Protein backbone atom coordinates (compact mmCIF):
# COMPACT_ATOMS: atom_id res chain seq x y z
CA UNK A 1 0.00 0.00 0.00
CA UNK A 2 2.03 2.60 -1.43
CA UNK A 3 -0.89 5.63 -0.65
CA UNK A 4 -0.29 5.64 2.93
CA UNK A 5 2.49 5.03 5.29
CA UNK A 6 1.90 2.76 8.40
CA UNK A 7 2.62 4.91 11.71
CA UNK A 8 0.06 7.26 11.60
CA UNK A 9 -2.06 8.69 15.10
CA UNK A 10 -4.04 10.79 16.04
CA UNK A 11 -6.33 11.54 19.06
CA UNK A 12 -8.99 13.23 17.44
CA UNK A 13 -9.93 11.31 14.34
CA UNK A 14 -11.87 12.66 11.83
CA UNK A 15 -12.47 13.11 7.96
CA UNK A 16 -14.64 15.64 5.64
CA UNK A 17 -16.18 14.55 2.65
CA UNK A 18 -16.69 17.31 -0.24
CA UNK A 19 -19.59 16.45 -2.55
CA UNK A 20 -18.32 19.01 -5.51
CA UNK A 21 -20.50 19.16 -8.83
CA UNK A 22 -21.14 21.38 -11.75
CA UNK A 23 -24.64 21.01 -13.39
CA UNK A 24 -25.03 22.04 -16.99
CA UNK A 25 -27.80 23.09 -18.88
CA UNK A 26 -28.98 24.17 -22.50
CA UNK A 27 -32.77 25.34 -22.34
CA UNK A 28 -35.15 25.83 -25.35
CA UNK A 29 -37.21 28.91 -25.37
CA UNK A 30 -40.67 27.51 -24.75
CA UNK A 31 -39.27 25.63 -21.12
CA UNK A 32 -37.73 21.75 -23.02
CA UNK A 33 -34.66 20.72 -21.49
CA UNK A 34 -32.57 19.97 -24.44
CA UNK A 35 -29.48 18.65 -22.95
CA UNK A 36 -27.94 18.65 -19.27
CA UNK A 37 -25.85 16.79 -17.26
CA UNK A 38 -23.50 17.00 -13.55
CA UNK A 39 -20.22 16.44 -13.38
CA UNK A 40 -18.83 15.38 -9.65
CA UNK A 41 -16.31 14.80 -7.83
CA UNK A 42 -15.93 13.54 -3.47
CA UNK A 43 -13.08 14.69 -2.60
CA UNK A 44 -11.87 13.35 1.08
CA UNK A 45 -9.85 14.20 4.34
CA UNK A 46 -9.20 11.81 6.64
CA UNK A 47 -7.31 12.10 9.32
CA UNK A 48 -7.68 8.31 10.80
CA UNK A 49 -5.39 6.50 12.32
CA UNK A 50 -3.64 3.41 11.28
CA UNK A 51 -4.56 1.69 8.32
CA UNK A 52 -8.29 1.63 8.66
CA UNK A 53 -11.16 -0.17 6.49
CA UNK A 54 -13.37 2.60 4.90
CA UNK A 55 -16.57 1.93 3.15
CA UNK A 56 -18.26 4.47 1.18
CA UNK A 57 -22.46 4.43 0.90
CA UNK A 58 -24.30 6.79 -1.27
CA UNK A 59 -28.23 7.06 -2.88
CA UNK A 60 -26.96 4.71 -5.39
CA UNK A 61 -30.13 3.57 -6.82
CA UNK A 62 -28.66 0.14 -8.16
CA UNK A 63 -27.32 0.01 -4.10
CA UNK A 64 -36.23 7.43 -0.31
CA UNK A 65 -34.99 9.57 -3.28
CA UNK A 66 -31.85 7.44 -4.95
CA UNK A 67 -30.02 8.28 -7.81
CA UNK A 68 -28.65 6.82 -11.12
CA UNK A 69 -24.98 7.16 -11.96
CA UNK A 70 -23.77 7.03 -15.73
CA UNK A 71 -20.75 5.97 -15.48
CA UNK A 72 -17.89 7.13 -12.56
CA UNK A 73 -13.74 6.40 -11.96
CA UNK A 74 -12.06 5.56 -8.69
CA UNK A 75 -9.07 6.34 -6.99
CA UNK A 76 -6.66 3.36 -7.09
CA UNK A 77 -7.33 2.79 -3.34
CA UNK A 78 -10.50 1.62 -4.16
CA UNK A 79 -11.42 -2.41 -4.67
CA UNK A 80 -13.44 -2.98 -7.60
CA UNK A 81 -16.39 -5.23 -6.84
CA UNK A 82 -19.91 -5.70 -8.76
CA UNK A 83 -22.09 -6.18 -4.92
CA UNK A 84 -20.97 -2.09 -5.94
CA UNK A 85 -19.61 -1.28 -2.15
CA UNK A 86 -16.78 1.27 -1.92
CA UNK A 87 -14.01 -0.24 -0.29
CA UNK A 88 -10.21 1.73 0.09
CA UNK A 89 -8.06 2.21 2.63
CA UNK A 90 -7.60 5.74 2.26
CA UNK A 91 -4.58 8.12 1.91
CA UNK A 92 -3.82 10.51 4.53
CA UNK A 93 -5.61 13.93 4.13
CA UNK A 94 -6.81 14.59 0.87
CA UNK A 95 -7.65 12.61 -1.76
CA UNK A 96 -9.74 12.28 -4.40
CA UNK A 97 -11.75 9.43 -3.62
CA UNK A 98 -14.16 9.37 -7.00
CA UNK A 99 -15.39 10.80 -9.95
CA UNK A 100 -18.96 10.53 -11.52
CA UNK A 101 -21.06 11.65 -13.98
CA UNK A 102 -25.16 11.72 -14.55
CA UNK A 103 -27.50 12.72 -16.89
CA UNK A 104 -31.13 11.66 -15.33
CA UNK A 105 -33.25 13.22 -12.24
CA UNK A 106 -30.89 16.14 -12.16
CA UNK A 107 -32.43 18.55 -10.00
CA UNK A 108 -32.20 21.98 -12.06
CA UNK A 109 -31.78 24.93 -8.99
CA UNK A 110 -32.75 27.91 -11.86
CA UNK A 111 -35.35 28.55 -14.00
CA UNK A 112 -34.78 31.42 -16.09
CA UNK A 113 -37.77 33.05 -17.97
CA UNK A 114 -37.20 35.78 -20.63
CA UNK A 115 -39.17 37.88 -22.32
CA UNK A 116 -38.53 40.08 -25.42
CA UNK A 117 -40.76 42.99 -27.17
CA UNK A 118 -39.10 44.93 -29.75
CA UNK A 119 -40.51 48.75 -30.04
CA UNK A 120 -40.50 49.81 -33.77
CA UNK A 121 -36.61 49.49 -34.52
CA UNK A 122 -35.28 52.00 -31.82
CA UNK A 123 -35.39 49.85 -28.42
CA UNK A 124 -35.81 46.56 -26.99
CA UNK A 125 -38.21 45.92 -23.39
CA UNK A 126 -36.60 42.69 -21.73
CA UNK A 127 -37.61 40.96 -18.53
CA UNK A 128 -36.24 37.95 -17.02
CA UNK A 129 -37.44 36.13 -14.07
CA UNK A 130 -35.62 33.45 -12.00
CA UNK A 131 -37.23 31.28 -9.76
CA UNK A 132 -35.29 29.10 -7.30
CA UNK A 133 -36.18 25.45 -7.30
CA UNK A 134 -35.10 23.72 -4.26
CA UNK A 135 -35.94 23.65 -0.04
CA UNK A 136 -36.33 26.96 0.90
CA UNK A 137 -34.51 26.33 4.24
CA UNK A 138 -31.31 26.32 1.34
CA UNK A 139 -29.94 29.71 0.08
CA UNK A 140 -27.70 30.03 -3.53
CA UNK A 141 -24.74 31.90 -3.35
CA UNK A 142 -22.95 34.22 -6.03
CA UNK A 143 -25.72 34.12 -8.87
CA UNK A 144 -25.02 36.03 -12.04
CA UNK A 145 -27.13 36.43 -14.77
CA UNK A 146 -25.68 37.41 -17.84
CA UNK A 147 -28.36 39.00 -20.40
CA UNK A 148 -26.14 39.52 -24.23
CA UNK A 149 -26.83 42.86 -25.55
CA UNK A 150 -26.79 43.47 -29.22
CA UNK A 151 -23.72 45.61 -31.15
CA UNK A 152 -25.85 48.21 -31.86
CA UNK A 153 -26.54 49.25 -28.58
CA UNK A 154 -26.88 52.95 -27.53
CA UNK A 155 -27.29 52.67 -24.09
CA UNK A 156 -29.25 50.56 -21.45
CA UNK A 157 -31.45 51.19 -18.83
CA UNK A 158 -32.39 48.50 -15.93
CA UNK A 159 -34.22 47.90 -12.84
CA UNK A 160 -34.45 45.10 -10.40
CA UNK A 161 -35.18 44.89 -7.30
CA UNK A 162 -32.91 42.48 -5.78
CA UNK A 163 -29.37 42.88 -6.63
CA UNK A 164 -27.01 44.96 -8.28
CA UNK A 165 -26.69 45.21 -11.97
CA UNK A 166 -24.72 47.05 -14.57
CA UNK A 167 -24.38 47.07 -18.68
CA UNK A 168 -20.79 46.16 -19.67
CA UNK A 169 -20.70 47.42 -22.80
CA UNK A 170 -17.30 45.90 -24.04
CA UNK A 171 -18.60 42.26 -23.05
CA UNK A 172 -21.95 43.33 -24.48
CA UNK A 173 -24.10 42.21 -21.47
CA UNK A 174 -26.02 43.30 -18.55
CA UNK A 175 -24.64 41.50 -15.88
CA UNK A 176 -27.28 41.21 -12.94
CA UNK A 177 -25.86 39.67 -9.53
CA UNK A 178 -27.56 38.34 -6.61
CA UNK A 179 -25.47 37.47 -3.19
CA UNK A 180 -27.79 35.58 -1.87
CA UNK A 181 -31.35 33.92 -3.01
CA UNK A 182 -33.49 31.49 -1.31
CA UNK A 183 -35.47 28.35 -2.29
CA UNK A 184 -39.17 28.10 -3.62
CA UNK A 185 -38.47 31.89 -4.93
CA UNK A 186 -39.03 34.46 -7.57
CA UNK A 187 -37.15 37.65 -9.15
CA UNK A 188 -37.04 39.60 -12.05
CA UNK A 189 -35.16 42.58 -13.75
CA UNK A 190 -36.65 44.61 -16.63
CA UNK A 191 -34.36 46.25 -18.74
CA UNK A 192 -34.74 48.58 -21.58
CA UNK A 193 -32.44 48.44 -24.52
CA UNK A 194 -31.73 51.76 -26.75
CA UNK A 195 -30.49 50.49 -30.08
CA UNK A 196 -28.27 52.69 -32.70
CA UNK A 197 -29.58 51.96 -36.40
CA UNK A 198 -27.99 49.24 -38.61
CA UNK A 199 -28.40 47.44 -41.32
CA UNK A 200 -32.08 46.45 -41.16
CA UNK A 201 -31.03 43.00 -43.49
CA UNK A 202 -28.65 41.32 -41.04
CA UNK A 203 -31.34 40.15 -38.15
CA UNK A 204 -29.74 39.35 -33.87
CA UNK A 205 -28.97 36.05 -33.59
CA UNK A 206 -29.73 35.84 -29.72
CA UNK A 207 -27.09 34.10 -27.53
CA UNK A 208 -28.78 32.69 -24.49
CA UNK A 209 -28.50 33.99 -21.19
CA UNK A 210 -26.95 32.17 -19.11
CA UNK A 211 -26.46 32.44 -15.25
CA UNK A 212 -23.69 31.47 -12.69
CA UNK A 213 -24.63 30.08 -8.75
CA UNK A 214 -23.43 28.49 -6.39
CA UNK A 215 -25.81 26.06 -3.90
CA UNK A 216 -25.38 23.96 -0.86
CA UNK A 217 -26.51 20.46 -2.54
CA UNK A 218 -25.96 18.14 -4.92
CA UNK A 219 -28.10 18.62 -8.32
CA UNK A 220 -27.40 14.78 -9.56
CA UNK A 221 -29.42 14.15 -6.33
CA UNK A 222 -26.59 12.49 -4.46
CA UNK A 223 -26.87 12.22 -0.78
CA UNK A 224 -23.81 10.06 1.44
CA UNK A 225 -25.57 7.75 3.32
CA UNK A 226 -22.42 6.74 5.43
CA UNK A 227 -18.66 6.55 5.98
CA UNK A 228 -17.69 3.25 7.89
CA UNK A 229 -14.52 3.13 9.35
CA UNK A 230 -13.00 -0.25 10.95
CA UNK A 231 -9.56 -0.44 12.48
CA UNK A 232 -9.16 -3.74 13.68
CA UNK A 233 -5.60 -3.50 15.11
CA UNK A 234 -6.53 0.28 16.86
CA UNK A 235 -8.72 0.69 19.54
CA UNK A 236 -11.56 2.94 18.26
CA UNK A 237 -14.64 2.28 17.00
CA UNK A 238 -16.42 3.51 13.76
CA UNK A 239 -18.88 5.60 16.34
CA UNK A 240 -15.40 7.65 17.62
CA UNK A 241 -14.83 9.09 14.20
CA UNK A 242 -16.19 12.80 13.89
CA UNK A 243 -17.70 12.75 10.42
CA UNK A 244 -18.82 15.42 8.31
CA UNK A 245 -19.99 16.38 5.11
CA UNK A 246 -20.61 19.29 2.64
CA UNK A 247 -22.10 19.84 -0.95
CA UNK A 248 -21.03 22.03 -3.15
CA UNK A 249 -22.79 22.64 -6.66
CA UNK A 250 -22.15 25.18 -9.51
CA UNK A 251 -23.18 25.90 -12.56
CA UNK A 252 -21.53 24.51 -15.58
CA UNK A 253 -23.03 25.93 -19.14
CA UNK A 254 -25.88 26.63 -17.63
CA UNK A 255 -28.11 28.07 -20.79
CA UNK A 256 -31.38 29.26 -21.77
CA UNK A 257 -32.21 30.50 -25.01
CA UNK A 258 -34.45 33.11 -25.71
CA UNK B 1 -21.64 24.41 5.43
CA UNK B 2 -19.99 21.15 7.10
CA UNK B 3 -23.02 18.87 8.84
CA UNK B 4 -22.71 16.28 10.13
CA UNK B 5 -23.56 12.69 8.33
CA UNK B 6 -25.85 11.28 9.77
Given at each position: ?????????YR?????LDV??????LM????????????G???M??????????????????????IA???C??????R?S???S??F?????????M???TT???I????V?PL????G???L??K?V??????????????????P????????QV????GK??????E???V??I?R??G??????????E???T??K????????S????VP??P??????????F?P??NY????????????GR??????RC | ??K???
Amino acid sequence: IGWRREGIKYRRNELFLDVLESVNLLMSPQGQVLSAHVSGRVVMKSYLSGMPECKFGMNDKIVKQSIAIDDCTFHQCVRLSKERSISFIPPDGEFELMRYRTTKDIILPFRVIPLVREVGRTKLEVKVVIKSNFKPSLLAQKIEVRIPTPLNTSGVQVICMKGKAKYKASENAIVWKIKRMAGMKESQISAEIELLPTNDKKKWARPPISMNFEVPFAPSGLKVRYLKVFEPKLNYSDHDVIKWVRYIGRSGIYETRC
Amino acid sequence: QYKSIL
